[PDB]
Amino acid sequence: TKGTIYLTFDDGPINASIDVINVLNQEEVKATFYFNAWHLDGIGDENEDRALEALKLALDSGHIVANHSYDHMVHNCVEEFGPNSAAECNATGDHQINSYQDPAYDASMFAENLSVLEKYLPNITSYPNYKANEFARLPYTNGWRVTKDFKADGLCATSDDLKPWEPGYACDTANPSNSVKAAIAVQNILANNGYQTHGWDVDWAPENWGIAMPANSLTEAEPFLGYVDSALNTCAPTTINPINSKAQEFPCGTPLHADKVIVLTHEFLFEDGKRGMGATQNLPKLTKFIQLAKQAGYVFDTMDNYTPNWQVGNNYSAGDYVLHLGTVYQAVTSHTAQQDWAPSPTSSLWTNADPATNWTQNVSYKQGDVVTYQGLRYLVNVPHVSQADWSPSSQNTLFTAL
Numbered sequence: 001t002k003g004t005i006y007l008t009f010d011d012g013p014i015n016a017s018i019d020v021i022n023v024l025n026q027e028e029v030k031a032t033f034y035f036n037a038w039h040l041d042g043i044g045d046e047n048e049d050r051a052l053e054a055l056k057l058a059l060d061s062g063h064i065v066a067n068h069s070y071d072h073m074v075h076n077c078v079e080e081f082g083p084n085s086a087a088e089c090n091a092t093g094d095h096q097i098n099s100y101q102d103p104a105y106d107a108s109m110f111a112e113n114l115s116v117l118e119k120y121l122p123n124i125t126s127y128p129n130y131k132a133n134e135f136a137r138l139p140y141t142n143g144w145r146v147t148k149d150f151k152a153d154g155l156c157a158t159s160d161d162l163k164p165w166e167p168g169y170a171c172d173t174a175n176p177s178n179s180v181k182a183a184i185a186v187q188n189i190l191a192n193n194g195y196q197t198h199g200w201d202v203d204w205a206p207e208n209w210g211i212a213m214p215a216n217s218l219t220e221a222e223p224f225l226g227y228v229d230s231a232l233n234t235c236a237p238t239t240i241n242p243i244n245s246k247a248q249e250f251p252c253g254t255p256l257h258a259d260k261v262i263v264l265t266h267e268f269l270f271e272d273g274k275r276g277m278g279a280t281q282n283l284p285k286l287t288k289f290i291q292l293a294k295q296a297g298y299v300f301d302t303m304d305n306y307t308p309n310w311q312v313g314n315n316y317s318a319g320d321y322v323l324h325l326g327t328v329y330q331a332v333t334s335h336t337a338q339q340d341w342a343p344s345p346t347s348s349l350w351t352n353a354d355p356a357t358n359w360t361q362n363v364s365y366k367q368g369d370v371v372t373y374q375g376l377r378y379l380v381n382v383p384h385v386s387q388a389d390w391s392p393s394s395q396n397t398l399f400t401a402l
């Protein structure tokens with residue numbers, strides 16, 4: 001195959017999600033939906049009376065449901081959050097301004113998301129494709145927490161003052177905005193609580209946000225496949241436009257990113273309504289893009305498989321990454337997986353390579369790594385694989401207390 005495409009849809013569930021899902025099912029592909037549950041509450045300022053129907057359809061159809069936070073951080077767009085905040089933020093267009101403020105409260109919106117999803121769909125945890133407690137994507141931000149050595153931040157994603165297109169706008173990646181730093185803190189909180197976060201390589205969006213009906217200008221299937229072609233193995237998160245969509249320190253050539261393209265788009269771009277004739281004009285583009293991509297040799301997959309799940313009988317090379325029960329592991333040696341020898345906190349064949357920064361058992365630590373343990377920070381003096389009796393302490397010379 002040519003490569004793997006991960007179609008990811010942000011900001012549902014809304015009425016428009018249903019026709020998108022129907023096209024996906026027509027074309028026999030699965031996608032990943034990064035949902036904001038405030039649409040279930042009817043306060044997200046979209047056509048969303050069928051939001052619960054949409055959520056159920058996504059899950060019953062086998063699509064992955066992942067975590068985009070309860071309210072898309074819109075509580076940070078207004079003075080006091082309420083049923084009208086979505087409309088208010090849409091009126092000012094200030095979504096990307098002061099988007100992240102208090103990292104604790106902002107990170108709690110991912111937990112809130114889980115509570116509201118489970119409120120509206122009480123048996124949601126019985127779907128294997130419900131993954132919202134393990135996979136997240138931050139509003140506005142091409143941020144990544146995938147493995148211990150695969151992390152990146154959107155250093156111009158959000159602003160303290162001006163939007164990227166406004167006069168006087170400047171981004172200093174060496175001295176980023178307070179909003180950007182708060183988002184980084186949110187990423188780190190989520191990682192320490194077991195989340196992976198993923199950004200995107202290409203964003204399927206209007207070619208012209210300036211016309212009357214912007215959605216109509218969504219890239220045609222044929223040239224959008226060209227964009228995907230151009231992104232395959234070219235470190236797209238560092239070169240993507242606009243500037244607020246960049247992940248400047250993305251680790252180009254990192255092994256898990258090879259031969260893969262993550263597409264970001266939004267089901268609201270596939271709706272006949274306030275943004276244009278999205279359903280009539282753009283659902284056919286979605287259909288033909290999927291068909292063209294398959295015929296060009298791509299396959300479609302979902303974000304639960306971006307890091308491949310550990311599988312009995314698979315051959316692994318030293319250095320390979322897998323997921324096992326939500327945790328990333330890296331292969332210590334080349335071997336063939338057997339059912340009774342799975343990755344674990346004590347496995348000789350695997351070390352934990354989660355993107356967390358709390359001290360963790362069975363991690364291959366490097367000199368200079370910083371860990372947190374019992375509320376204290378420590379710096380690793382020498383590379384080693386952590387084990388239970390080598391936890392940080394003031395007497396453990398593997399570490400220096402900071």
Ligand SMILES: [Ca+2]
Nearest residue numbers: 194195326327
């Ligand atoms: Ca995890």
Ligand SMILES: [Zn+2]
Nearest residue numbers: 010011139140
């Ligand atoms: Zn979003």
